[PDB]
Design a binder for this molecule. Structure first.
Ligand SMILES: *[C@H]1O[C@H](CO)[C@@H](O)[C@H](O)[C@H]1NC(C)=O
Ligand SMILES: [Cl-]
Length: 485
Protein backbone atom coordinates (compact mmCIF):
# COMPACT_ATOMS: atom_id res chain seq x y z
CA UNK A 1 0.00 0.00 0.00
CA UNK A 2 1.65 3.18 -1.29
CA UNK A 3 2.80 5.64 1.39
CA UNK A 4 4.04 9.19 0.85
CA UNK A 5 6.66 10.28 3.38
CA UNK A 6 6.67 13.86 4.65
CA UNK A 7 9.50 13.60 7.20
CA UNK A 8 12.14 10.94 7.82
CA UNK A 9 14.63 11.68 10.61
CA UNK A 10 16.86 8.64 10.01
CA UNK A 11 17.86 9.57 6.44
CA UNK A 12 18.53 13.17 7.53
CA UNK A 13 18.25 18.53 10.03
CA UNK A 14 18.99 20.01 13.47
CA UNK A 15 15.66 20.59 15.21
CA UNK A 16 14.79 23.09 17.94
CA UNK A 17 15.53 22.17 21.55
CA UNK A 18 13.89 23.92 24.48
CA UNK A 19 15.36 24.94 26.70
CA UNK A 20 18.67 25.09 24.81
CA UNK A 21 21.59 23.24 26.37
CA UNK A 22 20.02 20.92 28.93
CA UNK A 23 17.28 18.53 27.85
CA UNK A 24 17.05 16.94 24.41
CA UNK A 25 20.42 16.68 22.68
CA UNK A 26 21.58 15.32 19.33
CA UNK A 27 23.90 12.32 19.78
CA UNK A 28 25.94 9.91 17.62
CA UNK A 29 27.23 6.32 17.61
CA UNK A 30 29.05 3.98 15.23
CA UNK A 31 27.73 0.93 13.36
CA UNK A 32 28.38 -0.82 10.04
CA UNK A 33 30.85 1.92 9.12
CA UNK A 34 27.97 4.42 9.14
CA UNK A 35 26.87 7.40 11.29
CA UNK A 36 23.77 7.05 13.48
CA UNK A 37 21.96 10.08 14.90
CA UNK A 38 19.51 10.35 17.80
CA UNK A 39 17.91 12.85 20.17
CA UNK A 40 18.41 11.82 23.78
CA UNK A 41 17.69 13.16 27.24
CA UNK A 42 18.53 11.54 30.57
CA UNK A 43 17.57 13.89 33.39
CA UNK A 44 16.17 11.38 35.87
CA UNK A 45 17.99 12.72 38.94
CA UNK A 46 16.62 16.22 38.41
CA UNK A 47 13.28 16.66 40.18
CA UNK A 48 11.28 18.42 37.47
CA UNK A 49 11.75 17.83 33.76
CA UNK A 50 9.94 19.62 30.95
CA UNK A 51 12.13 19.17 27.88
CA UNK A 52 10.66 19.90 24.45
CA UNK A 53 12.00 18.78 21.07
CA UNK A 54 10.35 20.27 17.99
CA UNK A 55 10.59 19.03 14.43
CA UNK A 56 11.11 21.58 11.69
CA UNK A 57 8.03 22.68 9.72
CA UNK A 58 6.59 19.80 7.69
CA UNK A 59 4.50 20.58 4.61
CA UNK A 60 1.05 18.99 4.59
CA UNK A 61 0.65 18.91 0.82
CA UNK A 62 -2.82 17.43 0.34
CA UNK A 63 -2.36 14.86 3.10
CA UNK A 64 -5.51 14.47 5.16
CA UNK A 65 -4.49 12.19 8.03
CA UNK A 66 -0.80 11.64 8.86
CA UNK A 67 0.74 8.57 10.47
CA UNK A 68 3.55 9.04 12.98
CA UNK A 69 6.01 6.18 13.51
CA UNK A 70 8.59 6.29 16.31
CA UNK A 71 11.49 4.02 17.26
CA UNK A 72 13.10 4.64 20.64
CA UNK A 73 14.76 3.09 23.69
CA UNK A 74 14.04 3.56 27.40
CA UNK A 75 16.24 2.80 30.40
CA UNK A 76 14.88 1.24 33.60
CA UNK A 77 14.37 3.82 36.36
CA UNK A 78 15.58 1.14 38.74
CA UNK A 79 19.14 1.18 37.40
CA UNK A 80 20.11 4.72 38.39
CA UNK A 81 21.94 5.45 41.67
CA UNK A 82 19.50 8.26 42.34
CA UNK A 83 16.73 6.26 40.70
CA UNK A 84 14.26 8.08 42.93
CA UNK A 85 10.54 8.54 42.27
CA UNK A 86 11.57 11.44 40.03
CA UNK A 87 12.23 9.01 37.17
CA UNK A 88 9.56 8.25 34.57
CA UNK A 89 9.55 5.75 31.71
CA UNK A 90 7.45 7.58 29.10
CA UNK A 91 7.34 10.76 27.04
CA UNK A 92 4.60 12.80 25.36
CA UNK A 93 3.84 13.46 21.69
CA UNK A 94 2.32 16.75 20.47
CA UNK A 95 1.59 18.52 17.18
CA UNK A 96 0.47 21.89 15.87
CA UNK A 97 -0.75 23.23 12.53
CA UNK A 98 0.17 26.59 11.01
CA UNK A 99 0.25 28.50 7.73
CA UNK A 100 3.77 29.82 8.27
CA UNK A 101 7.07 28.66 9.75
CA UNK A 102 7.27 29.93 13.32
CA UNK A 103 10.99 29.24 13.16
CA UNK A 104 12.42 29.65 16.65
CA UNK A 105 9.14 31.04 17.99
CA UNK A 106 8.22 27.80 19.75
CA UNK A 107 5.25 28.15 22.10
CA UNK A 108 4.10 25.11 24.10
CA UNK A 109 0.53 26.34 24.60
CA UNK A 110 -0.07 26.21 20.84
CA UNK A 111 0.50 22.45 20.76
CA UNK A 112 -2.08 19.66 21.05
CA UNK A 113 -1.17 16.45 22.87
CA UNK A 114 -1.55 13.37 20.69
CA UNK A 115 -0.83 10.69 23.30
CA UNK A 116 1.70 9.42 25.81
CA UNK A 117 4.30 6.99 24.52
CA UNK A 118 5.16 3.93 26.62
CA UNK A 119 7.99 1.43 25.97
CA UNK A 120 7.11 -1.99 24.60
CA UNK A 121 10.63 -3.02 25.63
CA UNK A 122 12.49 -1.48 28.58
CA UNK A 123 16.29 -1.81 28.66
CA UNK A 124 19.08 -1.79 31.27
CA UNK A 125 22.10 0.25 30.12
CA UNK A 126 14.05 -0.71 20.61
CA UNK A 127 10.41 0.24 21.11
CA UNK A 128 8.33 0.90 18.00
CA UNK A 129 5.15 2.97 18.17
CA UNK A 130 2.71 4.46 15.69
CA UNK A 131 -0.05 7.03 16.04
CA UNK A 132 -2.08 9.26 13.72
CA UNK A 133 -3.92 12.57 13.64
CA UNK A 134 -6.42 14.13 11.28
CA UNK A 135 -7.90 15.89 9.63
CA UNK A 136 -5.16 18.38 8.84
CA UNK A 137 -6.11 21.52 6.90
CA UNK A 138 -3.23 24.03 6.98
CA UNK A 139 -0.05 24.60 4.96
CA UNK A 140 2.15 22.72 7.41
CA UNK A 141 2.48 21.18 10.86
CA UNK A 142 5.07 20.58 13.56
CA UNK A 143 5.66 17.57 15.76
CA UNK A 144 6.85 18.07 19.33
CA UNK A 145 8.23 15.55 21.80
CA UNK A 146 8.01 16.32 25.51
CA UNK A 147 10.28 14.88 28.16
CA UNK A 148 9.01 14.83 31.74
CA UNK A 149 11.95 13.12 33.42
CA UNK A 150 13.01 9.91 31.70
CA UNK A 151 16.02 8.39 29.94
CA UNK A 152 14.90 8.24 26.30
CA UNK A 153 16.72 7.68 23.02
CA UNK A 154 14.79 8.75 19.92
CA UNK A 155 16.29 6.95 16.92
CA UNK A 156 13.60 7.33 14.27
CA UNK A 157 10.50 9.26 13.33
CA UNK A 158 8.49 8.83 10.15
CA UNK A 159 5.42 10.80 9.20
CA UNK A 160 3.51 9.71 6.12
CA UNK A 161 0.06 9.51 4.57
CA UNK A 162 -1.56 6.52 2.89
CA UNK A 163 -2.70 6.48 -0.73
CA UNK A 164 -5.20 4.59 -2.90
CA UNK A 165 -3.87 2.86 -6.04
CA UNK A 166 -4.95 3.84 -9.54
CA UNK A 167 -7.21 1.26 -11.19
CA UNK A 168 -9.76 0.56 -13.90
CA UNK A 169 -13.09 -0.77 -12.67
CA UNK A 170 -16.14 -1.34 -14.86
CA UNK A 171 -14.72 0.44 -17.91
CA UNK A 172 -13.98 3.42 -15.67
CA UNK A 173 -10.56 4.72 -14.60
CA UNK A 174 -9.82 6.17 -11.15
CA UNK A 175 -6.50 7.89 -10.31
CA UNK A 176 -4.24 7.71 -7.25
CA UNK A 177 -6.30 9.33 -4.50
CA UNK A 178 -5.16 10.39 -1.06
CA UNK A 179 -6.83 8.30 1.65
CA UNK A 180 -9.55 9.96 3.70
CA UNK A 181 -9.23 11.16 7.27
CA UNK A 182 -12.43 9.84 8.85
CA UNK A 183 -14.94 7.19 7.79
CA UNK A 184 -18.17 9.11 8.60
CA UNK A 185 -16.86 11.88 6.34
CA UNK A 186 -15.49 9.96 3.36
CA UNK A 187 -15.44 11.90 0.09
CA UNK A 188 -16.37 10.42 -3.28
CA UNK A 189 -14.00 10.02 -6.23
CA UNK A 190 -15.22 10.33 -9.82
CA UNK A 191 -13.91 7.96 -12.48
CA UNK A 192 -13.66 8.67 -16.19
CA UNK A 193 -14.83 6.40 -19.02
CA UNK A 194 -12.36 4.38 -21.07
CA UNK A 195 -12.27 5.15 -24.80
CA UNK A 196 -15.48 4.04 -26.51
CA UNK A 197 -17.24 3.58 -23.16
CA UNK A 198 -20.07 5.69 -21.72
CA UNK A 199 -22.59 6.04 -18.91
CA UNK A 200 -26.06 5.23 -20.33
CA UNK A 201 -29.28 7.21 -19.77
CA UNK A 202 -29.69 7.16 -16.99
CA UNK A 203 -27.60 4.96 -14.73
CA UNK A 204 -25.24 6.07 -11.97
CA UNK A 205 -21.95 7.63 -13.06
CA UNK A 206 -18.71 5.93 -11.85
CA UNK A 207 -17.69 6.69 -8.27
CA UNK A 208 -15.52 5.17 -5.52
CA UNK A 209 -14.29 6.03 -2.01
CA UNK A 210 -10.73 6.12 -0.66
CA UNK A 211 -10.72 4.71 2.87
CA UNK A 212 -8.33 5.59 5.70
CA UNK A 213 -6.35 2.36 5.31
CA UNK A 214 -5.60 3.28 1.69
CA UNK A 215 -8.22 0.91 0.28
CA UNK A 216 -10.94 1.50 -2.34
CA UNK A 217 -14.30 1.02 -0.65
CA UNK A 218 -17.79 1.36 -2.16
CA UNK A 219 -17.96 1.20 -6.00
CA UNK A 220 -20.85 3.22 -7.39
CA UNK A 221 -22.21 3.31 -10.93
CA UNK A 222 -20.55 1.85 -14.01
CA UNK A 223 -19.43 2.51 -17.58
CA UNK A 224 -20.66 0.42 -20.50
CA UNK A 225 -19.24 0.06 -24.00
CA UNK A 226 -20.75 2.60 -26.39
CA UNK A 227 -22.95 1.42 -29.28
CA UNK A 228 -21.05 -0.27 -32.10
CA UNK A 229 -18.50 -1.48 -29.57
CA UNK A 230 -18.13 -4.46 -27.24
CA UNK A 231 -16.07 -5.25 -24.15
CA UNK A 232 -12.85 -7.21 -24.60
CA UNK A 233 -10.97 -7.70 -21.34
CA UNK A 234 -10.97 -4.17 -19.91
CA UNK A 235 -11.20 -2.25 -23.18
CA UNK A 236 -13.78 -1.65 -25.90
CA UNK A 237 -13.32 -2.87 -29.47
CA UNK A 238 -15.55 -2.13 -32.45
CA UNK A 239 -17.98 -4.84 -33.54
CA UNK A 240 -16.52 -7.16 -36.16
CA UNK A 241 -17.75 -6.64 -39.72
CA UNK A 242 -21.04 -8.53 -39.93
CA UNK A 243 -22.11 -7.74 -36.39
CA UNK A 244 -23.88 -4.88 -34.65
CA UNK A 245 -24.73 -3.33 -31.28
CA UNK A 246 -27.44 -0.66 -31.26
CA UNK A 247 -27.48 0.25 -27.57
CA UNK A 248 -24.70 0.49 -24.98
CA UNK A 249 -25.29 -2.72 -23.02
CA UNK A 250 -23.24 -5.42 -21.32
CA UNK A 251 -24.01 -7.95 -24.05
CA UNK A 252 -21.60 -8.87 -26.88
CA UNK A 253 -21.92 -7.82 -30.51
CA UNK A 254 -24.74 -9.69 -32.23
CA UNK A 255 -24.57 -10.93 -35.81
CA UNK A 256 -26.75 -9.17 -38.39
CA UNK A 257 -30.35 -10.49 -38.64
CA UNK A 258 -32.13 -11.98 -41.65
CA UNK A 259 -32.38 -10.06 -44.93
CA UNK A 260 -29.66 -7.54 -44.04
CA UNK A 261 -26.47 -6.42 -45.75
CA UNK A 262 -23.12 -7.42 -44.18
CA UNK A 263 -22.15 -4.56 -41.87
CA UNK A 264 -18.88 -2.55 -41.75
CA UNK A 265 -16.65 -2.46 -38.66
CA UNK A 266 -18.18 -0.94 -35.52
CA UNK A 267 -21.75 -1.24 -36.77
CA UNK A 268 -24.72 -0.06 -34.73
CA UNK A 269 -27.20 -1.49 -37.24
CA UNK A 270 -27.36 -3.70 -40.34
CA UNK A 271 -29.16 -2.08 -43.29
CA UNK A 272 -31.73 -4.33 -45.01
CA UNK A 273 -31.23 -5.76 -48.51
CA UNK A 274 -33.22 -4.34 -51.43
CA UNK A 275 -36.73 -5.74 -51.25
CA UNK A 276 -37.05 -5.63 -47.47
CA UNK A 277 -37.65 -2.76 -45.04
CA UNK A 278 -37.99 -1.88 -41.37
CA UNK A 279 -40.69 0.21 -39.71
CA UNK A 280 -39.98 3.11 -37.34
CA UNK A 281 -41.60 1.03 -34.61
CA UNK A 282 -39.13 -1.74 -35.45
CA UNK A 283 -36.05 -2.32 -33.25
CA UNK A 284 -32.78 -2.78 -35.15
CA UNK A 285 -32.72 -6.24 -33.58
CA UNK A 286 -35.42 -7.78 -35.78
CA UNK A 287 -34.83 -8.71 -39.45
CA UNK A 288 -36.09 -6.40 -42.19
CA UNK A 289 -39.54 -7.56 -43.31
CA UNK A 290 -41.91 -7.43 -46.29
CA UNK A 291 -45.49 -6.53 -47.29
CA UNK A 292 -48.04 -9.38 -47.17
CA UNK A 293 -49.65 -11.35 -49.96
CA UNK A 294 -53.37 -10.84 -50.55
CA UNK A 295 -55.73 -12.79 -48.29
CA UNK A 296 -55.55 -16.48 -49.18
CA UNK A 297 -59.24 -16.77 -50.13
CA UNK A 298 -62.47 -14.78 -49.95
CA UNK A 299 -66.11 -15.86 -49.68
CA UNK A 300 -69.24 -13.72 -49.65
CA UNK A 301 -72.53 -15.54 -49.05
CA UNK A 302 -75.44 -13.10 -48.88
CA UNK A 303 -78.44 -14.04 -46.76
CA UNK A 304 -81.07 -11.63 -48.10
CA UNK A 305 -79.89 -8.02 -47.86
CA UNK A 306 -76.86 -8.90 -45.72
CA UNK A 307 -73.67 -10.67 -46.75
CA UNK A 308 -70.80 -12.56 -45.11
CA UNK A 309 -67.27 -11.75 -46.20
CA UNK A 310 -65.13 -14.50 -44.70
CA UNK A 311 -61.42 -14.61 -45.50
CA UNK A 312 -58.08 -16.02 -44.42
CA UNK A 313 -54.65 -14.52 -43.58
CA UNK A 314 -52.08 -14.06 -46.38
CA UNK A 315 -50.07 -17.06 -47.56
CA UNK A 316 -47.10 -14.80 -46.92
CA UNK A 317 -47.25 -12.63 -43.79
CA UNK A 318 -44.16 -10.86 -45.08
CA UNK A 319 -42.62 -11.88 -41.77
CA UNK A 320 -44.85 -9.85 -39.46
CA UNK A 321 -47.71 -10.19 -36.96
CA UNK A 322 -49.21 -6.72 -37.49
CA UNK A 323 -51.30 -7.57 -40.55
CA UNK A 324 -54.53 -5.60 -40.89
CA UNK A 325 -57.27 -5.81 -43.53
CA UNK A 326 -59.11 -3.11 -45.49
CA UNK A 327 -62.39 -3.53 -47.40
CA UNK A 328 -63.90 -1.43 -50.20
CA UNK A 329 -66.91 -1.82 -52.47
CA UNK A 330 -68.17 -1.41 -56.05
CA UNK A 331 -71.83 -0.79 -56.91
CA UNK A 332 -70.15 1.21 -62.15
CA UNK A 333 -68.14 2.82 -59.36
CA UNK A 334 -67.46 3.00 -55.58
CA UNK A 335 -70.34 2.37 -53.17
CA UNK A 336 -71.74 5.36 -51.29
CA UNK A 337 -72.66 5.39 -47.60
CA UNK A 338 -75.62 3.19 -48.54
CA UNK A 339 -73.86 0.06 -47.24
CA UNK A 340 -73.49 -0.60 -43.51
CA UNK A 341 -70.45 -2.40 -42.15
CA UNK A 342 -70.82 -4.48 -39.00
CA UNK A 343 -67.47 -2.97 -38.03
CA UNK A 344 -65.26 -0.10 -39.24
CA UNK A 345 -64.11 -1.18 -42.74
CA UNK A 346 -60.55 0.15 -42.66
CA UNK A 347 -57.92 -1.07 -40.23
CA UNK A 348 -59.52 -4.40 -39.36
CA UNK A 349 -57.93 -7.20 -37.33
CA UNK A 350 -60.70 -9.78 -37.70
CA UNK A 351 -61.22 -11.91 -40.82
CA UNK A 352 -64.95 -11.56 -41.42
CA UNK A 353 -67.41 -8.68 -41.76
CA UNK A 354 -71.14 -8.30 -42.35
CA UNK A 355 -72.37 -5.58 -44.69
CA UNK A 356 -76.08 -4.86 -45.04
CA UNK A 357 -78.61 -2.63 -46.80
CA UNK A 358 -77.88 -3.78 -50.35
CA UNK A 359 -80.58 -2.61 -52.77
CA UNK A 360 -81.54 -5.77 -54.72
CA UNK A 361 -80.91 -6.17 -58.45
CA UNK A 362 -77.31 -4.96 -58.32
CA UNK A 363 -74.14 -7.03 -58.02
CA UNK A 364 -71.51 -5.35 -55.88
CA UNK A 365 -67.85 -6.31 -55.88
CA UNK A 366 -65.97 -6.06 -52.61
CA UNK A 367 -62.19 -5.93 -52.50
CA UNK A 368 -60.22 -6.88 -49.40
CA UNK A 369 -56.54 -5.97 -49.21
CA UNK A 370 -54.11 -7.11 -46.53
CA UNK A 371 -51.30 -4.87 -45.31
CA UNK A 372 -48.80 -4.75 -42.46
CA UNK A 373 -46.62 -2.20 -40.67
CA UNK A 374 -44.35 -2.04 -43.70
CA UNK A 375 -46.90 -1.57 -46.50
CA UNK A 376 -46.73 2.20 -46.13
CA UNK A 377 -43.19 1.89 -47.48
CA UNK A 378 -44.06 0.45 -50.89
CA UNK A 379 -46.67 1.55 -53.44
CA UNK A 380 -47.89 -1.90 -54.49
CA UNK A 381 -51.27 -3.45 -53.65
CA UNK A 382 -52.12 -6.99 -52.56
CA UNK A 383 -55.83 -7.79 -52.45
CA UNK A 384 -58.60 -10.27 -53.26
CA UNK A 385 -61.95 -9.53 -54.89
CA UNK A 386 -65.45 -10.99 -54.59
CA UNK A 387 -68.82 -10.02 -56.07
CA UNK A 388 -72.44 -10.86 -55.21
CA UNK A 389 -75.89 -10.03 -56.59
CA UNK A 390 -79.09 -10.70 -54.66
CA UNK A 391 -81.95 -11.58 -57.00
CA UNK A 392 -84.60 -11.13 -54.30
CA UNK A 393 -86.42 -8.11 -55.71
CA UNK A 394 -88.82 -7.13 -54.54
CA UNK A 395 -91.81 -7.56 -52.17
CA UNK A 396 -94.56 -6.13 -54.45
CA UNK A 397 -97.08 -3.62 -53.11
CA UNK A 398 -100.56 -5.06 -53.62
CA UNK A 399 -103.83 -3.14 -53.52
CA UNK A 400 -107.23 -3.42 -55.19
CA UNK A 401 -108.75 -0.92 -57.61
CA UNK A 402 -112.11 -2.56 -58.22
CA UNK A 403 -114.64 -4.81 -56.53
CA UNK A 404 -117.73 -6.76 -57.57
CA UNK A 405 -120.14 -9.42 -56.33
CA UNK A 406 -118.01 -11.96 -58.20
CA UNK A 407 -114.83 -10.18 -59.30
CA UNK A 408 -111.83 -8.45 -57.74
CA UNK A 409 -109.61 -6.00 -59.63
CA UNK A 410 -106.13 -6.37 -58.17
CA UNK A 411 -102.91 -4.50 -58.95
CA UNK A 412 -99.33 -4.37 -57.66
CA UNK A 413 -96.36 -2.01 -57.98
CA UNK A 414 -92.55 -2.11 -57.96
CA UNK A 415 -89.74 0.33 -58.98
CA UNK A 416 -88.68 0.23 -62.68
CA UNK A 417 -84.97 -0.39 -61.92
CA UNK A 418 -86.13 -3.78 -60.60
CA UNK A 419 -88.80 -4.47 -63.23
CA UNK A 420 -85.96 -5.95 -65.29
CA UNK A 421 -85.23 -9.14 -63.34
CA UNK A 422 -88.84 -10.13 -62.63
CA UNK A 423 -89.50 -13.01 -65.02
CA UNK A 424 -93.19 -13.42 -64.19
CA UNK A 425 -95.72 -12.35 -61.54
CA UNK A 426 -97.41 -15.30 -59.82
CA UNK A 427 -100.83 -14.49 -58.37
CA UNK A 428 -102.29 -16.67 -55.63
CA UNK A 429 -105.69 -16.51 -53.96
CA UNK A 430 -108.18 -18.53 -51.92
CA UNK A 431 -111.21 -18.12 -49.68
CA UNK A 432 -110.70 -17.56 -45.95
CA UNK A 433 -110.28 -20.81 -44.01
CA UNK A 434 -109.82 -22.94 -47.13
CA UNK A 435 -106.41 -24.62 -47.17
CA UNK A 436 -107.15 -27.47 -49.59
CA UNK A 437 -107.67 -25.28 -52.65
CA UNK A 438 -105.32 -22.78 -54.29
CA UNK A 439 -105.97 -20.50 -57.27
CA UNK A 440 -102.88 -19.58 -59.26
CA UNK A 441 -102.34 -17.63 -62.48
CA UNK A 442 -99.23 -16.01 -63.95
CA UNK A 443 -98.70 -12.89 -66.04
CA UNK A 444 -96.19 -10.18 -66.95
CA UNK A 445 -98.72 -7.45 -66.24
CA UNK A 446 -98.94 -5.26 -63.15
CA UNK A 447 -102.71 -5.75 -62.92
CA UNK A 448 -105.23 -8.58 -63.06
CA UNK A 449 -108.96 -9.17 -62.59
CA UNK A 450 -110.26 -12.22 -60.72
CA UNK A 451 -113.37 -13.74 -62.30
CA UNK A 452 -116.15 -16.01 -61.07
CA UNK A 453 -116.14 -15.59 -57.28
CA UNK A 454 -118.63 -15.77 -54.41
CA UNK A 455 -120.20 -12.58 -53.00
CA UNK A 456 -119.50 -11.33 -49.47
CA UNK A 457 -116.32 -13.35 -48.97
CA UNK A 458 -112.84 -12.31 -47.86
CA UNK A 459 -110.12 -13.70 -50.12
CA UNK A 460 -106.39 -14.08 -49.45
CA UNK A 461 -104.25 -12.55 -52.20
CA UNK A 462 -100.54 -13.28 -52.53
CA UNK A 463 -98.43 -11.90 -55.40
CA UNK A 464 -94.87 -13.12 -55.95
CA UNK A 465 -92.39 -11.56 -58.38
CA UNK A 466 -90.31 -14.57 -59.46
CA UNK A 467 -86.67 -14.06 -60.48
CA UNK A 468 -86.42 -16.20 -62.33
CA UNK A 469 -87.83 -19.49 -61.05
CA UNK A 470 -88.45 -20.23 -57.37
CA UNK A 471 -86.10 -17.40 -56.42
CA UNK A 472 -88.51 -14.46 -56.48
CA UNK A 473 -89.74 -12.13 -53.74
CA UNK A 474 -93.22 -12.55 -52.26
CA UNK A 475 -95.72 -9.91 -51.19
CA UNK A 476 -97.88 -9.23 -48.14
CA UNK A 477 -100.89 -11.53 -47.88
CA UNK A 478 -103.68 -9.00 -48.37
CA UNK A 479 -107.37 -9.54 -47.72
CA UNK A 480 -110.00 -8.23 -50.13
CA UNK A 481 -113.73 -8.91 -50.15
CA UNK A 482 -116.45 -9.22 -52.79
CA UNK A 483 -119.62 -7.12 -52.65
CA UNK A 484 -123.26 -7.81 -51.77
CA UNK A 485 -126.37 -7.29 -53.96
C1 LIG B 1 -74.61 -9.76 -61.68
O1 LIG B 1 -75.14 -9.00 -62.74
C2 LIG B 1 -74.25 -9.05 -63.83
C3 LIG B 1 -74.59 -7.93 -64.78
O2 LIG B 1 -73.98 -6.78 -64.22
C4 LIG B 1 -74.29 -10.43 -64.48
O3 LIG B 1 -73.31 -10.49 -65.50
C5 LIG B 1 -74.02 -11.52 -63.45
O4 LIG B 1 -74.47 -12.75 -63.96
C6 LIG B 1 -74.70 -11.22 -62.10
N1 LIG B 1 -74.18 -12.08 -61.05
C7 LIG B 1 -73.99 -13.39 -61.21
C8 LIG B 1 -74.60 -14.29 -60.16
O5 LIG B 1 -73.36 -13.87 -62.15
CL1 LIG C 1 -7.34 11.69 15.16
Amino acid sequence: AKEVVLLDFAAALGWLTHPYGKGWDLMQNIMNDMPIYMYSVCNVMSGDQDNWLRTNWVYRGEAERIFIELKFTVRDCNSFPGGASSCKETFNLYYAESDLDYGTNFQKRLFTKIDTIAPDEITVSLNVEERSVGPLTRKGFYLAFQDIGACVALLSVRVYYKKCPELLQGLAHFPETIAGSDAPSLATVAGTCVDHAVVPPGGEEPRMHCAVDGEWLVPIGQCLCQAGYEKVEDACQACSPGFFKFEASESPCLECPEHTLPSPEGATSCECEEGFFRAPQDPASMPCTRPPSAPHYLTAVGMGAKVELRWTPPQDSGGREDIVYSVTCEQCGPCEASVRYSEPPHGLTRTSVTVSDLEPHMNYTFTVEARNGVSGLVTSRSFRTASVSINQTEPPKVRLEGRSTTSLSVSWSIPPPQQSRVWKYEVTYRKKGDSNSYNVRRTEGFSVTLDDLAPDTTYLVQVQALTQEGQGAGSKVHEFQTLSP
